[PDB]
From Swiss-Prot, chain A:
Transmembrane segments: none annotated. The keyword Hydrolase applies. Residues 45-220 form the HD domain. It comes from the Bacteria. It comes from Vibrio cholerae serotype O1 (strain ATCC 39315 / El Tor Inaba N16961). InterPro entries: dGTPase, dGTPase-like, dNTPase_2, HD/PDEase_dom, HD_domain, PHydrolase_assoc_dom. This is Deoxyguanosinetriphosphate triphosphohydrolase-like protein 1. SMART domains: HDc (SM00471).
From Swiss-Prot, chain B:
Transmembrane segments: none annotated. This is Deoxyguanosinetriphosphate triphosphohydrolase-like protein 1. The keyword Hydrolase applies. Signal peptide: none annotated. Pfam families: HD_assoc. GO terms for biological process: dGTP catabolic process. Residues 42-209 form the HD domain. One of its GO terms (molecular function) is dGTPase activity. Keywords: Hydrolase. It comes from the Bacteria.
Length: 400, 390
């Protein structure tokens, strides 16, 4: 249906709707901010999103070669590009630590969650248009609904514990109008099935399943090289954790190649390590196919997802778990997040103490307008959510 | 009795013919807990106490030969003075107050308790018994030989031994008869201590009294006008003849501005305090010779020392620049404790995170966090605090 190319709102511009979405995302302030989030390491959320985008287009290429039946349905290069460039747009300062703080400070006003924030930025906050954010095409928006339910569908009481305040995932109720618009050309039967729970949503569109696989592959492999050279993991820990589990993961290529992959990763030469990384990436990409979703969805973008081969899934889950155990869940990273969450909570409590007086004037004006609907807190939340770590540190110093 | 020379666990190389106390001294010097005294110096203070301590032993065994066999060897009295201050946390008394408050529902915190816990359990020289020192050395570190359950500015800690260290305290006191053990446990304050520990306490007191006094005068923290009114006048009436006679000159040698003249005044004071110590029997029907005798300073000489100690605390410690530093330190320690106990597994170092997981099977995680903070230097605690809050 051409309704998937429509937007909420030149002669020589012959680009597809998806090429225009990619250009908008590339130009947005929200995208440029991912560059902020004694060595020469510069891996950011922006570089993570470029690598996901390049894996995404490679996944599409492999499916259009092995499954021609689906060549009309698969996303174009710029559509899968657009979903990977945007997937991390909504993340707050200080990663999960920022997210926990904002969610707790919004406990009585809809909460905070990064995927919801991503939806809110592209449909409203990014000022590319006056009233519809980046004003992206409907299918692009559908590809961004990793959790296509409202947070009303998906309380903790009682120094703060991370387990107690991790947000549920979904779409803010204050963005329901833009969600209703995205789901409008769906039959009622597809619409009531899309919000079905496994609370945790179960379903997503085909374009979004591809982006999720590319994101998961990027996270799994492209963090791994610099973890090795920075010394965050030794050869011994790689053998005990990753290599042994990959030798028993059940996929024949990994069981065959792990010994040689481990020697290449610890070669000490970039031109050798990249071939291990390239082979891992390629082994994972070539193991993805589109199969039908186990729900009686009627719309083709919901009736089919891309799935990775299960034994290959175990290998990917070993890699993702490994980067989480030696790159993220280390005290050096977790203290930075604790500090960030203490910082975010300070800014919120001061700024909500008197928003008109302390907010920048343009944000103060948005706060006054929003109080006609008593949604002032969400304005403070958007403002803190769009800060970089450096901007938040500077605001905190001005206040404390 | 050999039992005193024993260690909690059992090989010595055939060519090692050192006494148990020479090996205790070597372990203490090689420990990380000792090396930390350079940051906290407390190491300088402990070397001064050690060298005063052997001075006391030498002078007693010359005036009271009946006790030559009983007095501690040089390496034993060395070990107790080198180890005495191991348990002190960052920020000194302000740190001690904050930790004890954060541990109010879990056994408290106290520096002398921490010292015992480090040498019996925490220092990883052995897998299960810390530095595994000889029993008599351990007995010498028990300035307060009761449990903190018996002895428990409002938060200053009571003094004693942690209940979580009851096993190694029982082991240390095991070769004592019932009557000695029930006499040793006699805020409440303990009354008794071993001979080795009485000599060490005198050495720590003389070193605190005089060697802190020397830098305060050069550093300008005390001028002659306040020295004359507070300490010098009080020493002219303290009842010790040596101080009443020699106070006027010493006061001019102390403000000479020449290091080698000043050393003579300090040296004369220390020797004066040192020669006025003797071994007398303890006022209790103890059977064990190490508990039946203490070293005591002659009472009038004792009053002069308390004039010296009160002057060093009133003009070097109880001054606002130092006290504000202690208020900050205690806010900083409480900050760390609240972040760390908020999520230990994510915030503690992985080795310490592991000890916390193991310790909660006995619901002893709070003591692991307290151990970790107590072992920080000021620079460590300050850098950790910045990682969590600034
Ligand atoms: Ni990602
Ligand atoms: Ni001392």
């Amino acid at each position: 249906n051409p309704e998937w190319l429509a937007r909420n709102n030149r002669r020589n511009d012959h680009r597809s709707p998806f090429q225009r979405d990619r250009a908008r995302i590339l130009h947005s302030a929200a995208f440029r901010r991912l560059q902020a989030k004694l060595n020469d390491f510069h891996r950011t959320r922006l570089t993570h999103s470029l690598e996901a985008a390049q894996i995404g287009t490679g996944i599409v290429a492999q499916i259009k070669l092995k499954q021609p039946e689906f060549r009309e349905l698969l996303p174009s290069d710029s559509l899968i590009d657009s979903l990977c460039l945007a997937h991390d747009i909504g993340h707050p300062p200080y990663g999960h630590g920022g997210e926990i703080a904002l969610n707790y400070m919004m406990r009585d006003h809809g909460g905070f969650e990064g995927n919801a924030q991503t939806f809110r930025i592209v449909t409203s906050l990014e000022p590319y248009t006056e009233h519809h954010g980046m004003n992206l095409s409907r299918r692009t928006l559908l590809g961004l609904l990793k959790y296509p339910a409202l947070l009303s569908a998906t309380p903790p009481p009682a120094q703060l514990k991370a387990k107690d305040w991790s947000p549920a995932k979904g779409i803010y109720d204050c963005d329901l109008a833009s969600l209703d618009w995205v789901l409008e050309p769906l039959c009622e039967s597809d619409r009531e099935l899309l919000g079905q729970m496994r609370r945790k949503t179960r379903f997503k569109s085909l374009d979004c399943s591809i982006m999720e696989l590319a994101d998961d592959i990027a996270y799994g492999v492209h963090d791994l090289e610099d973890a090795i050279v920075l010394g965050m993991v030794t050869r011994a820990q790689w053998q005990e954790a990753a290599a042994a589990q990959l030798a028993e993961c059940g996929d024949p290529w990994f069981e065959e190649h792990i010994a040689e992959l481990s020697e290449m990763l610890f070669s000490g030469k970039h031109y050798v390590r990249k071939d291990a990384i390239g082979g891992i990436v390629n082994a994972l990409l070539t193991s993805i196919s589109v199969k039908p979703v186990e729900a009686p969805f009627h719309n083709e973008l919901l009736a089919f997802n891309a799935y990775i081969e299960p034994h290959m899934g175990n290998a990917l889950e070993v890699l993702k778990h490994f980067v989480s155990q030696y790159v993220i869940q280390i005290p050096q990273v977790q203290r930075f997040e604790y500090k960030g969450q203490q910082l975010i909570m300070d800014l919120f409590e001061a700024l909500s103490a008197d928003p008109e007086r302390l907010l920048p004037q343009a944000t103060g004006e948005k706060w006054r307008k929003a109080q006609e609907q008593d949604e002032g807190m969400r304005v403070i939340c958007d403002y803190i959510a769009a800060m970089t770590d450096a901007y938040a540190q500077r605001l905190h110093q001005q206040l404390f």
